[PDB]
């Protein structure tokens, strides 16, 4: 194939690329997702309702405060085939190294991983513009579409933040309720692999183990989302004989 496996999206081609995605989603209704963001800059203080509560209050504090940098969406059909048009889309969001908050370590990691911060400052997408398109796209609010993620608390929180444009709910129970309306059918591969199957490996280590090859750069959301899709179908085949167990629906790792 002579076209790009990873389609990059900027403010200049947002509408075109969303139009392409909208035209494909009915035929390729399995969406795998990842996000990149500027890390964690703080831990909230006090003592907490649990341990997951502490995890949720950490997430909420940082996701509310730190701007999204990339979202990766990889479409597949129900047997794992990607559209020939694109193995994955990578949405690149507006960010300003001089003005915005971030963990310096994360910016360095993203830079080494290939993020063009100057270009994100110049033609990065506004999350709000993306969110209007995403909500009307057919990908969310639809039981017909399955979302696939990995260790997904922050990743899903960033998408909910984009769509709602307001601070996240104060308690996990409320976050979970609203999340399951926008993403009514989702699987977290980390929950499946570690919490159910007692395999603690990370995304890349699972792919290496299963001999699944990565296309694109590690630690970029497009490539990470595509690897997520490929691991999902291989796990479904190897440990679920083709049919994922319904007890794993909508369970997020660590929350
Ligand atoms: Mg992720
Ligand atoms: Mg990633």
From Swiss-Prot:
Binds 1 Mn(2+) ion per subunit. It catalyses: Exonucleolytic cleavage of poly(A) to 5'-AMP. Its EC number is 3.1.13.4. Zn(2+) binds at residues 34, 36, 224. Belongs to the CAF1 family. Keywords: Activator, Cytoplasm, Exonuclease, Hydrolase, Magnesium, Manganese, Metal-binding, Nuclease, Nucleus, Phosphoprotein, Repressor, RNA-binding, Transcription, Transcription regulation, Zinc. This is Poly(A) ribonuclease pop2. It comes from Schizosaccharomyces pombe (strain 972 / ATCC 24843) (Fission yeast). It is found in: Cytoplasm; Nucleus. Its cofactor is Mn(2+); Zn(2+); Mg(2+). Mg(2+) binds at residues 34, 36, 155, 224. GO terms for biological process: nuclear-transcribed mRNA catabolic process, deadenylation-dependent decay; nuclear-transcribed mRNA poly(A) tail shortening; regulatory ncRNA-mediated gene silencing. The chain holds residues 20 to 274 of 335 of the full protein. One of its GO terms (molecular function) is manganese ion binding. Its main location: cytoplasm. GO terms for cellular component: CCR4-NOT complex; CCR4-NOT core complex; cytosol; nucleus; P-body. Acts as the catalytic component of the CCR4-NOT core complex, which in the nucleus seems to be a general transcription factor, and in the cytoplasm the major mRNA deadenylase involved in mRNA turnover. In vivo and in vitro, caf1 has 3'-exoribonuclease activity with a preference for poly(A) RNAs.
């Amino acid at each position: 194939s002579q076209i790009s496996p990873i389609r990059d999206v900027w403010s200049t081609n947002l509408q075109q690329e969303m139009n392409l995605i909208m035209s494909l989603i009915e035929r390729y209704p399995v969406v795998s997702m990842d996000t990149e963001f500027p890390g964690v800059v703080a831990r909230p203080l006090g003592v907490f309702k649990s341990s997951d509560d502490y995890h949720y209050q950490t997430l909420r504090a940082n996701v509310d405060s730190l701007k999204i940098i990339q979202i990766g969406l990889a479409l597949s059909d129900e047997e794992g085939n990607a559209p020939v048009e694109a193995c994955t889309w990578q949405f690149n969001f507006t960010f300003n190294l001089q003005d915005d908050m971030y963990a310096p370590e994360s910016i360095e990691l993203l830079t080494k991983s290939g993020i063009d911060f100057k270009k994100h400052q110049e033609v990065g997408i506004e999350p709000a513009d993306f969110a209007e398109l995403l909500i009307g796209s057919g990908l969310v609010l639809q039981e017909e579409v399955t979302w696939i993620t990995f260790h997904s608390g922050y990743d899903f929180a960033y998408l909910l933040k984009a769509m709602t444009q307001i601070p996240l709910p104060a308690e996990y129970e409320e976050f979970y309720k609203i999340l399951c309306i926008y993403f009514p059918k989702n699987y977290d591969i980390k929950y499946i692999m570690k919490s159910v199957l007692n395999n603690s490996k990370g995304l890349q280590d699972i792919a290496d183990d299963l001999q699944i090859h990565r296309i694109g750069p590690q630690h970029q959301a497009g490539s990470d989302a595509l690897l997520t899709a490929r691991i999902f179908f291989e796990i479904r085949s190897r440990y679920f004989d083709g049919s994922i167990d319904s007890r794993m629906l909508n369970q997020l790792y660590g929350l």
